Ligand binder design. Structure first.
Ligand SMILES: Cc1cn2c(-c3cnn(CC(=O)Nc4cc[nH+]cc4F)c3)c[nH+]c2c(Nc2cc(C[N@@H+]3CCC[C@@H](C)C3)ns2)n1
Length: 249
């Protein structure tokens, strides 16, 4: 249905592992959006193709306020184009580089917004499995918006995923705890200088808190960062946690 001709391309917003995402404007409507321009080569040469058709069919039917909407797609001779919602306030990754760390109030609200989005996702049996600051964006109101559902650093992946074992929706609960720690501390709990140092830290669940981390934050992260998935809470408990209710908005 769509074609490059129907849009006016703007500045590059960011370069990713398969191509770049540009600011764009559909000519007739004047609708501002994000144009993820990915190379057919870089994608197909790494056997990724199947995940992009997934991202297409998942992100398009996925309608929620905290989920980057996908309006459509197309593919010319050399490249592949996904027409996406534009997050005026950019990535959470960039915000965290600017601020270094986020306060208890900004963290709680992001976990809440992630939790509500993931709660909606776990209904259609949609598990993200790849939540990380780079895939978390910010709408006009500074509200969190998740991108890239088609699915590499180990940081946010739980033991089950890395060890090649059976995984559930509980994978995203763990990622929420790696994020909650990261947003408050400024680095993820298992951050190491090698894949193998990280693989060991995640496997043995070896992480520490700086002095400033609140007891309620120490609690939630510790509840979420459990090796056995069953022992992790579920989203309705995260949303009802005393640290989240006290500090969220
Ligand atoms: C980078 C980027 C991406 N955007 C998306 C988007 C769409 N898809 N995805 C996922 C994806 O591209 N993934 C991906 C790409 C390639 N290969 C593998 C992959 F997995 C993110 C939507 N909106 C944006 C966006 N908006 C911005 C606003 C401002 C405005 N800014 C605010 C702060 C202060 C100042 C600088 C002004 N800056 S950036 N930025």
């Amino acid at each position: 249905q769509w074609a490059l001709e129907d849009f006016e391309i703007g500045r590059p917003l960011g370069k990713g592992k398969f191509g770049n995402v540009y600011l764009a404007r559909e000519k007739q409507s004047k609708f501002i959006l994000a144009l993820k321009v990915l190379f057919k080569a870089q994608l197909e040469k790494a056997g990724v193709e199947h995940q992009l058709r997934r991202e297409v069919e998942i992100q398009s039917h996925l309608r929620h306020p905290n989920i980057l909407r996908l309006y459509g797609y197309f593919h010319d001779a050399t490249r592949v184009y996904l027409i996406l919602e534009y997050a005026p306030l950019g990535t959470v990754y960039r915000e965290l580089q600017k601020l270094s760390k986020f306060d208890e109030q900004r963290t709680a609200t992001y976990i809440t917004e992630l939790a509500n989005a993931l709660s909606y996702c776990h209904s259609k049996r949609v598990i993200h499995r790849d939540i990380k600051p780079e895939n978390l964006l910010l709408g006009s109101a500074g509200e969190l918006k998740i991108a890239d559902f088609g699915w590499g650093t180990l940081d946010y992946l739980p033991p089950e995923m890395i060890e090649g074992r059976m995984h559930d929706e509980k994978v995203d609960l763990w990622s929420l705890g790696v994020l909650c720690y990261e947003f408050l501390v400024g680095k993820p709990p298992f951050e190491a200088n090698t894949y193998q140092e990280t693989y060991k830290r995640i496997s043995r669940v070896e992480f520490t808190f700086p002095d400033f981390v609140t007891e309620g934050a120490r609690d939630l992260i510790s509840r979420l960062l459990k090796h056995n998935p069953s022992q992790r809470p579920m989203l309705r408990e995260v949303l009802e946690h005393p640290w989240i209710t006290a500090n969220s908005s």
